[PDB]
Design a protein around this nucleic acid. Structure first.
Ligand SMILES: [Cl-]
Lengths: 93, 107, 512, 86, 95, 98, 88, 107, 93
DNA sequence: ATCGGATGTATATATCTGACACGTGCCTGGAGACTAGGGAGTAATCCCCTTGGCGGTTAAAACGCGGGGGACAGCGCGTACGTGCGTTTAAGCGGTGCTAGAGCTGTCTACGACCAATTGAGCGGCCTCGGCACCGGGATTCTCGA
DNA sequence: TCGAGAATCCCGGTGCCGAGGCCGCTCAATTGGTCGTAGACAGCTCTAGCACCGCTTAAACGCACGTACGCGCTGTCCCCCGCGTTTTAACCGCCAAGGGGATTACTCCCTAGTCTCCAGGCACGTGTCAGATATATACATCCGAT
């Protein structure tokens, strides 16, 4: 048994970007699938980068390159900004 | 000995422990950096917020509260960057963006 | 005379021990140290080590009767040297001073070869494309009873010409340009050449140059090299020249380089001149000087400008991918984009003070215009030459410019009008290594040399455009350099190269 | 199963159904031979997808086709589907 | 009585504003589970599996007609013909 | 009079010539220079390999040939033989590239 | 003289000459060509090259190098989904 | 004892040992079986033999003795399944199939 | 700088299907790329396929299903038979 | 050019049902030591790249002209589509019933990981001679203007 | 509609350089053994899938009627092709010197993995009530003849 999901986290983000709306179950399923999809796509690209460069580990730099290589333009720069923000905040704690 | 989750330590809402576990147990590389989960969680949270805001705006436009696959579809298609990202993705029970070719209209 | 005898003489129907041994004994006639190279080669090549332990005063006093044009005294002995070279089963270099008379000298030698040794061809003469027509002219002039052709044109043109004359065997000498040789290497690869003559042998310095390789594959007995200046940069250039001359004797670069290696130097030189003595002659322009007053040289160790200095420092610290910019910086900042602010683009005086060398150049041209001289600026950037063009326009002087990309018709009309009877052309811009050696700028007498080169020989040829025969008052070199700059490094390297050339060759013509 | 295996089930994708799909696609006027072409292309697409889904479900040593199997087949053929797990 | 074109445009606007499935359910279920007997006999199908198949195929067909229409218009027509679908699939890379 | 081929027979000759050889049709230096100029928009102080540009030219020429084939198909569908920018636009639009 | 700028250079996309577009179109198998095709072709080629070079640069930048490699271009093309055989 | 390679044991021409090492180190799974490299090498060898046979056929129809990228291209494009498998692949220095639309032919 | 490549095995296969026929070098490099491509596609499919069923090994079953998924029809059944034959011979030896 | 119909689009009101808050078990994520090996750093070292310019050959590309056929428009006509209206059909839905087969749980054993030794396969370096590219010239084939 | 007439296919002679053997060495397959843990198999259980059945009503089918639209035809410009000068720029060969950019050896430290415990974060299962459907009536609005 024992099936996991991202529904709790998607709901937590939603009720801070639009703290009045809800979300249907089908929509929550769609958003969960979307998150898993993007996670798979970025992780695959990062692993392939590691394989190309003979490195044996996935690191924040490889995640950053994979993001710049998957997302289009404006999304790329915004996402990179927030990724670096979170990383520095975390490591200074 | 206070149990401070990395997810809170980084200031995110998405889980960083779960992302790290998926990276380790997902057959991506032998070793996984320390900040890699934090970065990837940040990116996922950003993308989720970006899509979810447009979906909520569309839901308000249709004067409804709870967002639905139709609203997600509208957000993705009306936006251009998300539409380029999800170029080959079909969204179940979504719809089609309303569009009628000009020639077909009456004179 | 007999075309069919020539036909069986030319085509090749199929370890030259005897002549090779004759040349080793001829060499060991002089001091045995000259057999160092031979013994090294023998120790490395087994096929000649067994050879070593096997152990006509044709002064030709008078000018050749068969050729007209009574000969000037100094080159009869050159003829004799060539003849002796021939009847010694060895090759040689002739390296006169670009004007002492070399085409005539070689043609006299060829005439002697034909009319006293009874051998009407075959001979090959390879020249730069500029001087091809000349060769035909003097061969038709001095010894008119001979046949040749320029061997040039379109594809089918050379094809028909070779099938008519070359493999038709209707020639005594054939003259062709370097690129022709590299292109028509097939038919000329089987002619059983008597001689191969190269004028301006600079082209063969790098052995790996494709022309050099194609030259090694040709079939001939003896080779003759005609040139102006050997050893532009290093001894390895003479190494390659001697490889081509005598491949058997000279076959180890490492021996040459190590055993010479630049008092240990005095111990080297006392060997050095002896080794090469029976291979190449160098005349002096002062032999039958009779003219060109020596060149008057000078240097103007200019400083730098405020923008010039800021740009220089800006490049010292860190789109720009070379140290060459540093020479660019000292030349004129407008070469970069990021000076001459605007853009409104004025021709005004904001030039001369803006760069350093421009100020002194302006002063000199003032002092020379106000007395009646003409100038031959020789910078080494065509693009920079355009800035001098604009500046000259501002002061409203009269151009005549030959860049690297000026078509030959423009070249000839420009040199004509500038060298026409007295006209209004104060300045003559030009880029250093351009035009070849046939330019006859004897009108002017100022050879200001805005930029300097990595080797002195290019400069010397540049001064030769006005120090050649003709101009008979004086010549004024005015090389410029910015102190505390990389051009000091370039200048010192060039000067020490010139010293090395002095030591190696310019003691030979003292004897010669 | 013992379901009395049937043929000519493609005609169940009827003319009004094809017309409605065309209208959603934005098509005003439709010729009369387009329905057979539509049935052919639908049959081909279904055959590909169902073949891959059956391959997955049979490798897993199962006997029931699952939504995950269909989703994997679609993702394999390049038609990623959101909403049915993933 | 409306004129040819009017009711077609009304239907276009209706169906681009809805979200439901345009093909029936039992007919598509029968078609799927009798295509599938060419690869292995006696299969069972999750209801979610049949629904996923239907949604995917309807999406595919709608996106196909959406390009058949451009092919028809580019040829200076407003009627879609089998040659238009053949061209659409040919260019799209299927055939 | 000097004889003249009717309009349409040199074009077929060239089709059946170029559709049988294998060399590169775009020149070399112009394409390499274009590649430099496009690239220095993203990162300044960058250099390429000759093999890198060669691969890039292979890919691009293949892309353009395959684009022109579908362009021709669209033009024939339009009951023409001349290919017009409308055809490029339709081919790129259908194929999902725009 | 105001001529120390010396050209505008038709900068670079008009280096894909109309005979070259004609050759590519013949190899594609077309008989007659309109006069405006030689500008659509340039536009679409520029788009394709930009998309490829962006990813090749990103790869060679992540590898901490300063030179772009045939392998990087191959990876970029495969990433776009245009696998190219023959360059390792 | 005496060494006896896994390729010889299998009867293959492709390196089972190298396939096994690549499969382990390629980050594909935690463990690899023993029959996996054998199966994979056999399949790769079959595909190579098919394509090379077709290419050689073409090179002999051309009346030359060596396979070149032109023959590789021409053999792949002329086989239905072999070309289906390689739709999104471009052979470097290959070519195109001789093909002219009929409508473009002279009357 | 030892660099491995499927050159000699391709040449061994060639010398038995057309015993007198050469292969220049660019054809060989193309064939090396093709072998690598196909290996990557099959191994990636097998990785995914094992992961979906929670398995941790890659077995000949995963490889067989991957080749059945990626190859078209008649080209797939021959490869399946060849692979099974090789496995049986190796396991019997 | 306006009425008359037909189809939206609001606005009210009633009924559901499925988001959503809340508690409950537990399992996983966190905390804290130890360690080893990956990767960062240093330094050879060497080989291809950069900048600016020169010289020459030779096809391609550019450009201008005539003129031919194709694109585009307009006209006509005759089907094949769309729109309505009865009539029949079968999908949708609620409901019952049964059982095959997903999905978990336990044991254990065969089989893959890991290691040390050992030895041939394979890779790089190197030499050579046939395959194929190219070049006349001769004959043959398709275009085309009578 | 047949004899130009040019383009192509096809023969030999080069020649040259790359494929293809051959050898040394080195390092990664192979052998033999240790051993721990996935997976294989059985058994259980209980969920969901298949199988019908009756009833309603909405969608499908069939047939009619009449336009408007697709296609064929006829001109007619005009713009693209074929061809003959004419210029230009790719493409080799060169010079000159750097240096900097990639690429092996070599050391070492610090950051991952690996462990052992253990408590809160998160998922499951529950009980609501309010945001969605789902009728109804009435007003607005295109659309189509007049
Ligand atoms: Cl002279």
């Amino acid at each position: 048994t024992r099936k996991e999901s991202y529904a709790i986290y998607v709901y937590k983000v939603l009720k801070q970007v639009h703290p009045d709306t809800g979300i249907s179950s089908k929509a929550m399923s769609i958003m969960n699938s979307f998150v898993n999809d993007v996670f798979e796509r970025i992780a695959g690209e990062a692993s392939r980068l590691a394989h190309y460069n003979k490195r044996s580990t996935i690191t924040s730099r490889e995640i950053q390159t994979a993001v710049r290589l998957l997302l289009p333009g404006e999304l790329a720069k915004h996402a990179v900004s927030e990724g670096t923000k979170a990383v520095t905040k975390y490591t200074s704690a | 000995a206070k149990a401070k989750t990395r997810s809170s330590r980084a200031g995110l809402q998405f889980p960083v422990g779960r992302v790290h576990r998926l990276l380790r147990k997902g057959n991506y590389a032998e070793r996984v950096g320390a900040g890699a989960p934090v970065y990837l969680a940040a990116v996922l949270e950003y993308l989720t917020a970006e899509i979810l805001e447009l979906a909520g705006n569309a839901a308000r436009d249709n004067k409804k509260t709870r967002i639905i696959p139709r609203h997600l579809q509208l957000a993705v298609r009306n936006d251009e960057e998300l539409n380029k990202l999800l170029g080959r993705v079909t969204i179940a029970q979504g719809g089609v963006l309303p569009n009628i070719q000009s020639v077909l209209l009456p004179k | 005379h007999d075309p069919e005898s020539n036909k069986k003489r030319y085509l090749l129907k199929d370890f030259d021990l005897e002549g090779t041994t004759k040349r080793f004994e001829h060499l060991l006639s002089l001091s045995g140290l000259f057999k160092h190279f031979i013994e090294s080669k023998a120790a490395k090549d087994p096929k000649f080590r067994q050879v070593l332990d096997v152990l006509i005063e044709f002064q030709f006093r008078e000018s050749p009767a068969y050729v007209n044009g009574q000969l000037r005294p100094y080159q009869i002995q050159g003829v004799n040297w060539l003849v002796s070279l021939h009847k010694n089963k060895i090759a040689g270099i002739l390296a006169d001073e670009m004007g002492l008379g070399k085409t005539l000298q070689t043609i006299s030698f060829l005439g002697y070869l034909r009319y006293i040794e009874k051998i009407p061809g075959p001979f090959l003469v390879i020249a730069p494309k500029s001087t091809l027509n000349n060769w035909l002219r003097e061969i038709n002039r001095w010894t008119p009873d001979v046949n040749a052709f320029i061997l040039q044109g379109d594809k089918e043109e050379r094809a028909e010409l070779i099938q008519k004359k070359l493999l038709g065997c209707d020639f005594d000498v054939v003259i062709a340009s370097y690129e022709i040789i590299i292109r028509e290497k097939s038919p000329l690869k089987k002619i059983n050449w008597e001689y191969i003559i190269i004028d301006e042998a600079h082209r063969i310095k790098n052995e790996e140059s494709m022309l050099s390789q194609v030259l090694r594959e040709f079939t001939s007995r003896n080779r003759l090299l005609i040139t102006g200046t050997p050893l532009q940069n290093n001894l390895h250039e003479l190494w390659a020249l001697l490889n081509f001359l005598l491949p058997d004797i000279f076959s180890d670069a490492q021996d040459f380089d190590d055993w010479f290696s630049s008092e240990d130097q005095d111990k080297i030189v006392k060997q050095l001149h002896t080794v090469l003595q029976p291979f190449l002659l160098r005349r002096i322009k002062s032999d039958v000087e009779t003219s060109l007053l020596p060149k008057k040289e000078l240097n103007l160790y200019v400083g730098m400008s405020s923008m010039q200095k800021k740009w220089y420092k800006k490049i010292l610290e860190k789109l720009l991918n070379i140290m060459m910019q540093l020479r660019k910086c000292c030349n004129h900042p407008y070469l970069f984009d990021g000076a001459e602010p605007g853009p409104p683009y004025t021709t005004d005086e904001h030039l001369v003070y803006n760069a350093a060398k421009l100020q002194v150049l302006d002063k000199l041209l003032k002092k020379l215009k106000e007395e009646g001289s003409r100038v031959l600026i020789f910078s080494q950037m065509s693009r920079l030459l355009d800035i001098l063009e604009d500046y000259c326009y501002f002061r409203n002087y009269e151009y005549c410019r030959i860049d690297g990309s000026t078509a030959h018709e423009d070249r000839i009309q420009a040199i004509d009008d500038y060298n026409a009877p007295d006209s209004k052309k104060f300045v003559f811009l030009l880029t250093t290594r351009a035009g070849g050696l046939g330019i006859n700028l004897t009108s002017a007498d100022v050879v200001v040399l805005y930029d300097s080169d990595w080797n002195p020989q290019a400069d010397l040829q540049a001064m030769d455009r006005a120090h050649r025969i003709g101009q008979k008052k004086q010549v004024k070199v005015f090389r410029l350099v910015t102190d505390n700059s990389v051009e000091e490094k370039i200048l010192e390297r060039a000067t020490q190269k010139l010293r090395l050339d002095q030591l190696v060759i310019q003691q030979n013509r003292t004897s010669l | 199963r013992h379901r009395k295996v049937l043929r000519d089930n493609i005609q169940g994708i009827t003319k009004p159904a094809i017309r409605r799909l065309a209208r959603r696609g934005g098509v005003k006027r439709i010729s009369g031979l387009i329905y057979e072409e539509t049935r052919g292309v639908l049959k081909v697409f279904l055959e590909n997808v169902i073949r891959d889904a059956v391959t997955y479900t049979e490798h897993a040593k199962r006997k029931t086709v699952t939504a995950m199997d269909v989703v994997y087949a679609l993702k394999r053929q390049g038609r990623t589907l959101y909403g049915f797990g993933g | 009585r409306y004129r040819p074109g009017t009711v077609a445009l009304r239907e276009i606007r209706r169906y681009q504003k809805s979200t439901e499935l345009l093909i029936r359910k039992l007919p598509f279920q029968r078609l799927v589970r009798e295509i599938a007997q060419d690869f292995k006999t006696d299969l069972r199908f999750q209801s979610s599996a049949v629904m996923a198949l239907q949604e995917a195929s309807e999406a595919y067909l709608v996106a196909l007609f959406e390009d058949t229409n451009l092919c028809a218009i580019h040829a200076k027509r407003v009627t879609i013909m089998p040659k238009d679908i053949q061209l659409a699939r040919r260019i799209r890379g299927e055939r």
